[PDB]
Amino acid sequence: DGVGNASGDWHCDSTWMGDRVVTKSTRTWVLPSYNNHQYREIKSGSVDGSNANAYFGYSTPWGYFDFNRFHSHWSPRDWQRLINNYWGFRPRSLRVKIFNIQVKEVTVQDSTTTIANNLTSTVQVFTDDDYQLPYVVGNGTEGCLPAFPPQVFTLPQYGYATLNRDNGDNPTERSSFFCLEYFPSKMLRTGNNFEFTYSFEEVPFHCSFAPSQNLFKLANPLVDQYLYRFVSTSATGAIQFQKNLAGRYANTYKNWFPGPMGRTQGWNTSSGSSTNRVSVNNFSVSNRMNLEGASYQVNPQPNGMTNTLQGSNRYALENTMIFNAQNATPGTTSVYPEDNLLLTSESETQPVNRVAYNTGGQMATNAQNATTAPTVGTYNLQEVLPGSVWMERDVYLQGPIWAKIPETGAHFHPSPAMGGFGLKHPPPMMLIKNTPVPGNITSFSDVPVSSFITQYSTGQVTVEMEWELKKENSKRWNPEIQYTNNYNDPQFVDFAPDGSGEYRTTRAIGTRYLTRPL
Amino acid sequence: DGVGNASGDWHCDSTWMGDRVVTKSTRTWVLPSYNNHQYREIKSGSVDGSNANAYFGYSTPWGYFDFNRFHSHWSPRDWQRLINNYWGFRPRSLRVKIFNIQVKEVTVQDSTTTIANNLTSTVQVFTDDDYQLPYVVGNGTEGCLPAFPPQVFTLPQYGYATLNRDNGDNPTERSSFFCLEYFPSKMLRTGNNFEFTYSFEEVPFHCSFAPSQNLFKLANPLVDQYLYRFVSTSATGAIQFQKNLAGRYANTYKNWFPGPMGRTQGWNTSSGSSTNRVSVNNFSVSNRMNLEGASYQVNPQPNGMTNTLQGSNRYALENTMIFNAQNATPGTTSVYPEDNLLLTSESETQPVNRVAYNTGGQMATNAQNATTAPTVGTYNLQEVLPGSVWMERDVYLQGPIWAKIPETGAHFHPSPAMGGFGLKHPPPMMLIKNTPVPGNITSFSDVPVSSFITQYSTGQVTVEMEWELKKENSKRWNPEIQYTNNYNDPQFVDFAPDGSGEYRTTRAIGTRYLTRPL
Amino acid sequence: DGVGNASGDWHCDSTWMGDRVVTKSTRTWVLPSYNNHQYREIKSGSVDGSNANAYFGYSTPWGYFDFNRFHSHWSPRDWQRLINNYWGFRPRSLRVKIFNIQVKEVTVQDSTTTIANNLTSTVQVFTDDDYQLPYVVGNGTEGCLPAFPPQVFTLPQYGYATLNRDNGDNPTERSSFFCLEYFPSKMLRTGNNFEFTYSFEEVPFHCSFAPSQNLFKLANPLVDQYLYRFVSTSATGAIQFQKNLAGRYANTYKNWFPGPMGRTQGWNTSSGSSTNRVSVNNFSVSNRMNLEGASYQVNPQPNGMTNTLQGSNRYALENTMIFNAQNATPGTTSVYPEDNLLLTSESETQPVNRVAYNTGGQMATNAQNATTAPTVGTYNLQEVLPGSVWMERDVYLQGPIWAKIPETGAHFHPSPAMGGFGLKHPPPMMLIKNTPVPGNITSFSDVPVSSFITQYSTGQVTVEMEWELKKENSKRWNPEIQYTNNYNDPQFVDFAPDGSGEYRTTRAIGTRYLTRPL
């Protein structure tokens, strides 16, 4: 529209209206000119002695907007209002708007770097509505809209891995190259803006409640069962039985079973670090799955287990989501102690989910005879069974919202391991790049020009999300557990900027506070 | 309405009308004043050396109506008419009515206990329509409407277990107390009655047929497959093949597989008791699952297996439903032989379901080389796989009808292990209690009165259920197996009262008699 | 209506609908025949050496329904939902219903006490709509509807004090006798019920929030004031000034002042009991007001002060509401330690209200000269001043809801000291009594009969209250403090019945959790 007219306003807000809540976030972004306007074939061989690290892909000159983290939409107080009062929620719609674009020309001379705006430069933007591009958004990576509204952020560079040959850095006949310029995109000069809208598919509500009953103790503790159980064999081999008494939950017949489990090693946090094995390199003794001839770690394991047992300091670390308390630099290889990190605990699900670091149980391992005694053996892993129930991983304020279900034609219970909503058609990738501007070209050449004017753009982005809420409807008499701002002798305010302006966050806030009977 | 006017009639009947059958049952109940009108915190530590027996809960002064057993609705003859003629059935609706209430005042003086009616006393009744209370009805417990119509029964006392801490008798911050008086209930004096109606959710038909074909022998025995199989390696290592011939079912390619299995120990009934290991305590060598740090027995195991192999006397007792031939007293710890009990056999499902006490099969356990021979190892347990089929547990005349699916947000194939229909919203809990009547209180006190007049109530209850039937539609030429009243030299009539008036039942009647090809 | 027909149902519930919440409570009561149907002149002289204890009054044969406590209407969980999510609330309407009346005849013979119902006996009920009777309901006395729904309670006996002469037990010419039979009342036999409705007058919302700013630090800490202050006098007597700098809150000019205060003694709870004066009898050294020649203690003092200073263990006990953790017997004179009681803390109001046990400040006490130095003196009490602000006492789950404003024709800020809503026309007194039934009178006499049949009645009472809520509307970013069910190593569930059936309550729950800037 115009150089001296704003193409949009600043909208950050939450509006609660019954069973709906609309969140609005606006952030300032900055887009670098990645790769110098070129596509590059990126590849890697075996790194750290693991050929599962090998890949073949492409880095593109495009950047992308990632809105896949709860804190990009929810302030800590609104999150508290959500988890203390509702049984569940789910995304309904999304509206994105990119505006107030500013393209800057950078010029370095002799020890001098000036910056001036280029009023005629454009920025290109498109959304991948048909999912024709490798969707890299739901894999727990950096670059999402920052939690704290005033924080300015750089858009991450779009890249992808395709097929590599024999766990090496070579491509195969099936490796695919995708050209992002081969999509129709809108071009924006300083007065133009871009708007996009999207609606989520019917997805089940995330469960924001913990069970107030144990799965194996659902029977009335005052009445016996009209069922009998084999208890022994007489001195002559006659089978003997007894009635299952009231309250003896170790013996009652069960109708339902706990979800699938796969044993993972348990480690003690600090209080119990003296009981941990010393100097052990976890990779060699970790849970791994094989695929195409290589072994990959599979944290945080499939859903169905609890990583800790409420009241203990032992964690099944590979079944745990681990966040940094602060934003880290790219490529850091420092070894962090637990004092800098935020460990998540899924102990609220222990009345239903089995403990990840213990054996799942025991089964018969032979045929009993008058000469051979009955034998049992414990099992470390057990997959899904008919009539089994479990609770999915909880969502966190600083964790992912959705994940795209891989299109293969066959899947089971499409719920991403890192938590969130599994979607067949998630919010489309929104790509953006600075349109190239050639330097001073005087003569002709059939070779593509390589000399460009260095630029970078900036602007604002606003994301509006409507969420549907599930009202709590309990008849519990006594008070419930609530997430509360409880600190003893605070030296600073959590979820607030400190003296240096840095946003501080000392806790990973889950969703499970309210209870429900089974 | 009035003291001298009946508030309802006696309806016991079955009406067959095409693909529908309506059952009506009326019984006389008696409600004691449980706990003396108080709520009590009930708890237990480790019992019988098992901390899975520990619990923390509440016993309430309420009683409840349980209609969750087939014989509370079906006479033995109607059950026979059902299982000999239909392929399946399922619940459609339910109507309950409580009437002809009589409250009796009990007064004991010096070695004298008189009983008079209290015309002004009430009884309180409510149904938990929103499932806000711990549903204790579908866990195979006593207290259901008796099988024989003239039998008067006592309503069981409502109680529940909530969360306990570290497998002990202490509560946790999440333990929930539910006050039943915090629900709106109808109050009834002698002339009043209470009626309730409910409709079942679309649930799949229970299958009342046995397969007349084996899962691995579905191929035409007269034609070969156009498929070849690896049979060996030559003296030089060349792989060799052969065509899969007609009728050689051990070698045909299969399209479908048997359901999941988990080996359980097998024991011989009497005929073969001399081949059983002697003096063995089953608990230590039983199939158990771990949950929250404790091990629980999980009878009757998940669906997918047959507990016996038709033609043998060996049973996988932990995969078996065991009923008493008669009603037992509360808390009995006698050790019963198999002569007093009714063992159920699921052998009709053996053409499809794997045998619970045998190994499930064998798989490769290494990589074959010119130096290492191919090795295989048997597996005792195997969970669900794509393209697998199995048959659910059969229902019995003396067994449960439904079970409530635990609300967790994630489950697989919600079919209760004890058989029946898995429901998200089952018939609501119907609670009832005698309204308290204070004794002679003369002075004031801020402390709740503890002195009450002792009462108990009685009345009639009628339950009407509509069932939907699936007609048999077979082209089998020869006669089918039918359940029949066949006894040799009967000393009494089964399913009839004996000389002392006691109702006798010598057999557990299943549902699988008709056959169907796969 | 009828002997065998219930005249009402049981309604206990809470229904939240936007800015309104309707609470319903039903309880069972028992009414003794107080005084044996007679009015008695009750009086007392000086008790415990205090003639403020003298009184002259009347005890009547009537009982009354008291609904003036929050826990008679709010379950602990609904209270938590209220205080964690709203900024305020206020009563809108009330509906009361008394039904299912049962009159019992008591007859004691030789060491035998039988109880039978008297179907023709009545109970009398009336409400004092015009406030013509001494309103004894809002003075923190026992007898209200019990907190726990299943608890049966005795109605307290209605009595009142009128004028006594010279602090003695004699009446004056102005002492008034009120005959309750001189009001029209409804008579109820077993089939009848009584209903009453009432609407509250526009009353201001109770404030359920704590200030997140201090009253004396409202100025921007980054900007100075354009005001100067007198700081000293030169060596020649010239007055000198300085500008009030940014953030120096000790010197900024203020626009508002803290509410009124009246120093009360401070005492240390247990942690600091070694610093308390030993063996001191509080009455002689307590805060007292004189009236009609006698001195009365005036706990909990007028509004405007905080009784504790967050972070300390010292309490201004006379400015504190003290509840028992359990119901106590009538007339107990035991000396309780703080381990049995629930002390309330108003520290949330300290940013605005002055500390009750410290001096209020200091003022000039002379006229400065070249010979006399300026002198200041501290003041222990200070009443209301123009431009002063304070916060009223908080309400508790176990405290009073309203108080009747004394009709005198002149009052200031009608807010009861014990907290709650001050009303000119509060819910009317609801009186009830057992109609007298003469014994066997054979001959005539002009003297009123004294021989009566001993009876007592019982029934149910339901109270429905509509409350209006004030939605929280904050822009605070970081999480707020919330009331939470947090206990470490619980041996029992708080706000739940224990093993003996007794309802336990270990905490007084206030209303101030959310914050607001000033």
Numbering used by the authors:
A (entry chain A), B (entry chain A), C (entry chain A): 209 to 726
List sentences from the manuscript:
Adeno-associated virus (AAV) is a small ssDNA satellite virus of high interest (in recombinant form) as a safe and effective gene therapy vector. Seeking understanding of the spectrum of interactions, goat AAVGo.1 is investigated, because its host is the species most distant from human with reciprocal cross-species cell susceptibility.
Just PKD1 was observed in the AAVGo.1 complex, with the two-domain PKD12 cryo-EM reconstruction and receptor density for the PKD1 subunit strongest at the viral interface. Displacements of ~1 Å are observed between PKD1 backbone carbons, and the shift appears to be a rotation around Arg353 that remains essentially unmoved. The complex of AAVGo.1 bound to PKD12 differed in modest ways at the VR-VII and VR-IX interfaces. In AAVGo.1, however, these residues are replaced by Ser442 and Ala443, and interactions with PKD1 Lys399 are absent. Therefore, AAV5 VR-IV has unique contacts with the PKD1 C terminus absent in the AAVGo.1-PKD1 complex. The lysine can be modeled within the density for Arg353 in the map of the AAVGo.1-PKD12 receptor complex, suggesting that goat AAVR might be only minimally different and that Lys353 might have interactions similar to what we observe with human PKD1 Arg353 in the AAVGo.1 binding pocket. At first approximation, the binding of AAVGo.1 to AAVR is similar to that of AAV5, so the one exception becomes a second structural class in terms of the mode of binding.
